[PDB]
């Protein structure tokens, strides 16, 4: 359960941390975070880690030194970072904190910052630059692609499940496969 570990470090608020960690144990959340007050809440928590759609450099240093990524070879680091982007993509989707037509904008930017960070660590994990850019285009809404993060999440777990199955099995929540 590497994910509840990382949420423990990332979310200082205990009510919100509780929300995120409880959601790892179910495939569907009926608590949503698309309302304006909720999006500002997330924004307050996660802005210190973001620089637009990218992780900011202080967050990156911190995260690469974490109990989760510190002594790992680049490829694993990248593979681990890829699954975390999938987790925030799920969190943003319609099965978790998102809805059919809306999603928590902040969680999409954090998922994007992790995917982008994974490409910087070892781009081989994606297998094609066109795939890396379709993933970004779907998280960000660019180039008229369908934005559905429920759909994006499937595309990410399918890649993880075939390209790096050990990592995926350990670093992606059991209830969510």
């Amino acid at each position: 359960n590497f994910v509840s570990g990382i949420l423990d470090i990332l979310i200082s608020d205990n009510e919100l941390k509780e929300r995120f960690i409880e959601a790892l144990n179910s495939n569907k959340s009926d608590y949503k975070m698309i309302a304006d007050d909720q999006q500002r809440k997330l924004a307050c928590v996660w802005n210190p880690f973001l620089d637009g759609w990218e992780l900011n450099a202080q967050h990156v240093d911190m995260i690469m030194g974490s109990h989760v990524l510190k002594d790992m070879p680049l490829r694993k680091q990248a593979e681990i970072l890829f699954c975390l982007g999938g987790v925030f993509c799920k969190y943003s989707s319609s099965d978790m904190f998102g809805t059919e037509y809306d999603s928590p904008e902040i969680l999409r930017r954090y998922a994007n910052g992790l995917i982008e960070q994974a490409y910087k660590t070892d781009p081989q994990v994606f297998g094609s630059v066109y795939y890396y850019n379709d993933i970004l285009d779907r998280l960000q809404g660019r180039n008229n692609v369908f934005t559905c993060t429920a759909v994006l999440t499937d595309m990410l777990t399918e890649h993880a499940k075939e390209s790096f199955p050990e990592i995926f099995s350990l670093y992606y929540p059991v209830a969510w496969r």
Binding site: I34, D36, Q39, R40, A43, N47, L50, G52, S92, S93, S94, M96, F97, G98, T99, E100, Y101, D102, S103, E105, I106, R108, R109, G141, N144, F146, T147, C148, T149, A150
Partner: protein, 75 residues
């Protein structure tokens, strides 16, 4: 007249507008300036969501008012 549109991260883009502009028209100027399509734009003022048939005057939006933009991307 200038207004400001703030994103969730603190970025502020500025528009030139008239009080009789519709919300469709405002979202269009953001697509001119920032490439964000209108159906991706959830605009807020004073806790109120800016509906598409309406004008800035309809919401008592005035010179140098600041609106909040939250991206509407499907889950």
């Amino acid at each position: 007249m200038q207004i400001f549109v703030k994103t969730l991260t603190g970025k502020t883009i500025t528009l030139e507008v008239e009080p009789s502009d519709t919300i469709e028209n405002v979202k269009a100027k953001i697509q001119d300036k920032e490439g964000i399509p209108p159906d991706q734009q959830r605009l807020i003022f004073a806790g109120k969501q800016l509906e598409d048939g309406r004008t800035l005057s309809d919401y008592n939006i005035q010179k140098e008012s600041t609106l909040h933009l939250v991206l509407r991307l499907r889950g």
